């Protein structure tokens, strides 16, 4: 970046000495910090959980948030929509008219993240499978299975609402949830 790399200009950066190493240390610390940030956010579980092959959860339709196995990305329709709405400008790949990533020739490269998109999607899938099949039990110990209407009846007691409010309106609450998830893609 400083010198044209076809020259003895680099023989005068030794007169300053410890400055470029200080940037390389600082940017390395930033990069390791970003990988640590992704690891702290998404690696909340030590086990990769899966949904049962029969996706019936008392009338609650999770097909727009669970991963779609018919696509090679192994992502949900919402996640496949989210990656399409971000005009991503990274250059974390080996592959070499010119675009904005011709700034690599001035010494400005982009390092790829430690966790790929597929591994973050698998962490998200494990978190979703845990919170659907086991409630809050998998986050404070071993995963304990529970019916999802029974899970939602536990979650209604956490807001001061009795259990019979859910069970006498289970179809209504399932329909409201399925309508509200479907409006997320439209929004």
């Amino acid at each position: 970046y400083i010198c044209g790399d076809s020259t003895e200009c680099s023989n005068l950066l030794l007169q300053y000495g410890s400055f470029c190493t200080q940037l390389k240390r600082a940017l390395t610390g930033i990069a390791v910090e970003q990988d640590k940030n992704t690891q702290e956010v998404f690696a909340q579980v030590k086990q990769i959980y899966k949904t049962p092959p029969i996706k019936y959860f008392g009338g609650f339709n999770f097909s727009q948030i669970l991963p779609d196995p018919s696509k090679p990305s192994k992502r949900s329709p919402i996640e496949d929509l989210l990656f399409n709405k971000v005009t991503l400008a990274d250059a974390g790949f080996i592959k070499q008219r010119d675009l904005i990533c011709a700034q690599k020739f001035k010494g400005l490269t982009v390092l790829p993240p430690l966790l790929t998109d597929e591994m973050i999607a698998q962490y998200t899938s494990a978190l979703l499978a845990g919170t659907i099949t086991s409630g809050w039990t998998f986050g404070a110990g071993p995963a304990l299975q529970i019916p999802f209407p029974m899970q939602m009846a536990y979650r209604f007691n956490g807001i001061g609402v009795t259990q019979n409010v859910l069970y006498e309106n289970q179809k209504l609450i399932a329909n409201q949830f399925n309508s509200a998830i479907g409006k997320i893609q439209d929004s």
Binding site: I2, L27, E33, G139
Partner: protein, 49 residues
């Protein structure tokens, strides 16, 4: 003797530019670290419970 002071002017320009870029990257990295700590806290307290 004259190309040296001309390139010393240019090299000090590139030194200042790189130090400025790394200072903004450290500030934005602190902001992204705060946002990621908030995201991990929201993951643990909204998703896991």
């Amino acid at each position: 003797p004259e190309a040296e002071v001309q390139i010393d002017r240019l090299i000090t320009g590139r030194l200042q530019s790189l130090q400025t870029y790394v200072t903004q990257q450290l500030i934005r990295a602190a902001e992204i670290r705060a946002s990621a700590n908030l995201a991990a806290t929201k993951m643990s307290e909204c998703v896991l419970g």
